[PDB]
Subunit: 372 residues, 3 copies
């Protein structure tokens, strides 16, 4: 009767967790390190590393319990503080629950890395730590519960395979609020290296979200290859048409645009949908950083816009008629789309409000703007 762990899924999921951690340490740190002024690199890398450590600790102390424990529509409980009452041999799905703790913790880490990396230039160090505590505890954790922890958005059938809302939109909005409150790249080879590490790690991010080494993991893997490639080509074509030539930063940005766009969709769509989502995301990203430029190192320009596009287009290309795996029983495309839009709107407002509270608390305690 009691579920038994499959060692193939244990192995797959521990390695996928390592790939996701790789996305933060050193992926996103190198990505931002090549974008910001050289004089701010060391401080940014320190803030990414220290806030990464903080997230790891908060996650085990109470974050996992409040995100994935049973509670209400908005948060879980505190019955798994420091993972108490989780037996070592406890199974979640087809893997040991300890591996689920680590895999889901690694997602919290990259989400925070996306914010801290972009704002470390301008925000005070003690203030970023305050902000991380506030926003992780009151925005990442409730939103993760609502989408992946059986809460409000899951109970309405929201489709988000690997975190278009939980990770990308959530962090993009936090970044924009930060930039609004706190008013050329020097090492593009480093930007490219970070981009590449983010790409390789993202296979653990997307495919690992199946929770098992099955055909859905395989689907998500292939769709991640295709969407990324198509968004690179889409971005680069739009750059050739708009600016006359492609650029390395454009190609890297296109890759990220496709990775973000396919994040919510990868486990639900066909390879034809992945190609279309990739092209659209690459072009919407290019448009986002162009026209929509309140954007610290273009957090929203890509993660926000492409996150929204992917979440919406997931409600389309999940349809069996378009090569997807099919909507749930009794769910039309029109209904699913409405659920995707509602989920996007809730994530935007929830993250913005918590982020405003986080930055304001930091500002009233220690001051936000980096000192003298």
């Amino acid at each position: 009767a009691p579920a038994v762990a499959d060692k193939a899924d244990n192995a797959f999921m521990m390695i996928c967790t390592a790939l996701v951690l790789f996305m933060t340490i050193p992926g996103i740190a190198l990505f931002y390190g090549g974008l910001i002024r050289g004089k701010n690199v060391l401080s940014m890398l320190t803030q990414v590393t220290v806030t990464f450590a903080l997230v790891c600790i908060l996650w085990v102390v109470y974050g996992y319990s409040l995100a994935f424990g049973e509670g209400n529509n908005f948060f879980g409980n505190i019955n798994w503080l420091m993972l108490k009452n989780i037996e070592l041999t406890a199974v979640m799905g087809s893997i040991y629950q300890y591996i689920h703790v680590a895999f889901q913790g690694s997602f919290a880490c990259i989400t925070v890395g996306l914010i801290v990396g972009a704002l470390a230039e301008r925000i005070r160090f003690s203030a970023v730590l305050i902000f991380v505590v506030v926003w992780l505890t009151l925005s990442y954790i409730p939103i993760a519960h609502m989408v992946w922890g059986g809460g409000l958005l899951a109970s309405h059938g929201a489709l988000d395979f690997a975190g278009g809302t939980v990770v990308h939109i959530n962090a993009a909005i936090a970044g924009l609020v930060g930039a609004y409150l706190i008013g050329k790249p020097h090492n593009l080879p480093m930007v490219f290296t970070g981009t590449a590490i983010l790409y390789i790690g993202w296979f653990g991010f997307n495919a690992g979200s199946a929770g098992t080494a099955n055909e859905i993991a395989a689907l998500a893997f292939v769709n991640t290859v295709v969407a990324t490639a198509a968004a690179i080509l889409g971005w680069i074509f739009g750059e050739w048409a708009l600016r006359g030539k492609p650029s390395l930063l454009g190609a890297c940005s296109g890759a990220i645009a496709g990775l973000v766009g396919v994040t919510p969709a990868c486990g639900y769509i066909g390879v034809g949908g992945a190609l279309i989502i990739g092209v659209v995301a690459g072009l919407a990203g290019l448009w986002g950083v162009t026209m929509l430029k309140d954007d610290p190192c273009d957090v929203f320009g890509v993660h926000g816009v492409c996150g929204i596009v992917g979440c919406i287009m997931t409600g389309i290309f999940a349809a069996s008629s378009l090569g997807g795996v099919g909507f749930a029983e009794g769910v039309t495309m029109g209904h699913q789309l409405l659920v995707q839009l509602e989920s996007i709107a809730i994530t935007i407002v929830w993250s913005g409000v918590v982020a405003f509270i986080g930055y304001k608390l930091a500002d009233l305690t220690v001051g936000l703007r980096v000192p003298e």
Copy 2:
């Protein structure tokens, strides 16, 4: 009756695919980035990234179908365009076929990365895209079909575990033709970093070519460690004897020489053969870049020479008497050697001719030499 996927092999093979993609993004890009003039790095990285995206797309659209579909001795068919008629739960060997699509696509990517990285300095950007289409479609795909897709060379019993011909010789010849038509490293730490990433990813390349996490994967893994180490020592000893001291570029080149040499052999030989092939490859590589120097960043000097040496020596050390896994029934060492040589010759001529056609078509459409 119908084959069932083993989740352990699914997991193994998806992670091996990620390791192979890692070899291109950022492996080979960093390798060449430290070798070429600083003023050409950004353009090379853009060309590697964009042509990588192009290969990914062409592979799914028609490349997989024409390489691994059933057809004739030279190419497959177009029954799997955009992977149509491949059910998601379809099994190939002991893994889902979708994972086979991705794994084999990643090999096409690194093969093209080897060419583009070396020639991006001198070739026009639109011309490289034309060349990639022509050469991928008419050289990589038919040669992959002939060797790994049940075509001409497979039907004669050619031994090539992970692509001495399909990947290394194929691309080396394309590189030389390019250099013939289009007539010191500045960041050796970057060269070393690329080399190291190529090394780690190559375990997915070599061991993943078993298609399963079995004793042949384990054999290929160990032989990859041994051959690489022995070629480093071989190259470095020859450099000490010839130039008076080892160098970092020598040590990295030796590593690549051993990785290339053991590619066709790793799943067929004993560890004693891997040591011998490594030493020979390291020394043949050193000789190749010395005496044979028409060599853009030494594509053939190592990949061509060591590819040929490895393919030949596979026909020797696969013998059971030498610790190998044994030739097929009824096959003597003399016969096997002849088959290896025939396979090498066909790959050289096929790739050269297609490459000449590719570069000439680009030259007549847009012009090959990078503009003003």
Copy 3:
């Protein structure tokens, strides 16, 4: 009757081996590369690469046989020279023995990389090769046999999951002897990149030491996340208190301190113990590099001190009452602690003496100090 390999464990363990190799190539090379004077980087990278190749070869020729073959309390035998008499399908635990050869060889590689990287600046190149042969054969191999090969320390019940003694203390002492005999960082972004690669690879190091993708691997994985995070925070808090501000080098050093401290403990302790060991290790590391500064690039300052702290605290937090997996039957905490201390003392003296012999033999043959 005969053991059968589990493909899930085969896959897990081959990938963990690749992650451990990643720690040396390029992990530890980049770590030291950013620490030492720019003018010595290329020579250090060459020495790390060439000695890495040497270790790989010695391991297969005789090192595996003498470390993990059956012999006496101090070394094995020479019945597995070049892995002869090891059938390809031979099983060790739940994986093919060939994979065990590679996994354990990768540990020898990182241990030597820790020494060579730190001393390459000052030691002659031919002398480091002599030293590596002597110390690998007479210190790493016997100590690995004593702890993990059924020898003296294993037979007394010493707890060392992933090599607090075999790897970290062993190499730290060899480093100090070297520095005693042979009397600011320029690229901190490179130090951070090396640190990050060491971190990701260390999951293969720690979790792979379970030999299987089971709940102990999962435990070791989570404890590695927690201990690393806590040591970062511990180090950084002590730096804030002592120096007034955190630094990037501090944050990276704290990470390494926690990784070292949890190495012997990760598979035996609860997550609460991992947090405590991480904090203590981070602070002991900070103290080590402060007060105890005979320290070439701070080998002992972190690997030695934190290795000792972790080995001792493993004898505490393995207790079931503290969340650990429990001491063996009939073993009190007091007895276990005494065994940990005895194991630490034997490793320190054994490594020091062999290291002195190694450096002296090199000095009498070729001379230790780098020439003119």
